[PDB]
């Protein structure tokens, strides 16, 4: 078995290997990359996502989210308070202000220490989940707006034609903005490109060990667990690396820098934080190997998780027993 310790792997494809996206994912899996839950892909030196980022300031963040924490430094939840609209130029100025800017630090490990010590005492503002793309239309390789769709994959594998669409999302971050512990909708893959700015640190649990994280989460968040049998689908719970180590949960960590891709694999729990002002683009995708994970994915039916239009068909076809209850949660 390849990669039996489930380490995060880093790949350096050549420009020739960068042509065929599906083929390269399958290659990475042949080397055991999926066992980690997360992989890094450094694009060939010839490649670029677009020519410059000089003209992005007028993008609108219609609903910036202030991420307010509750709990203790290593075990907390966050809720999202909606703020008034602002442009990317206005948000960048805010990120750089004395109130929100990255503190002085020695290196990424020092900044990580400071994040876990101090996150809960601040409420950073995240421009998340903005439909759109920063890839130039002429970028033909690893263009996250030109991937094969999940609906087409389901149709190719299973023969069933379904409604729905699959488009990318932009994320504008600042220091301390946080992504809570989660797997993707329907335990899909994700791919995330850091277009510009400061890094993003990731934590990940190997897919084969995801239920260990779920059992810890039920212990640490006992009211939430009584409320919902899949409350990590709410995307609000944080657990620090120190607490994971104290409870024996297997995990790994890595920092993504501008110009780098990350891929999350089916049922790879992940969480993380931004170092400073940045912009990322991400989208879900599927392969043949996902179908079995989609059939087994947990679902939130309590009403909290509320998701896209296109998840309806995935539940309806892959999980017809669960469909009626899940749809009630959506309505
Ligand atoms: O960058 C973020 O805030 C969160 N991204 C992801 O969870 C992802 O790409 O799967
Ligand atoms: Mg603009
Ligand atoms: Ni994710
Ligand atoms: Zn729920």
From Swiss-Prot:
GO terms, biological process: cellular response to ionizing radiation; chromatin remodeling; double-strand break repair via homologous recombination; inflammatory response; positive regulation of chromatin binding; positive regulation of double-strand break repair via nonhomologous end joining; regulation of gene expression; regulation of protein phosphorylation
GO cellular component annotations of the record: blood microparticle; chromatin; nucleoplasm; nucleus; pericentric heterochromatin; site of double-strand break
Boundaries of every JmjN domain copy: 8-50
Entry-annotated residues carrying PolyADP-ribosyl glutamic acid: 16-17
Gene Ontology molecular-function annotations: chromatin DNA binding; damaged DNA binding; histone demethylase activity; histone H3K9 demethylase activity; histone H3K9me2/H3K9me3 demethylase activity; metal ion binding
Sequence positions that bind Fe cation: 182, 184, 270
Record-stated family: Belongs to the JHDM3 histone demethylase family.
Protein name: Lysine-specific demethylase 4D
Range covered out of full length: 11 to 341 of 523
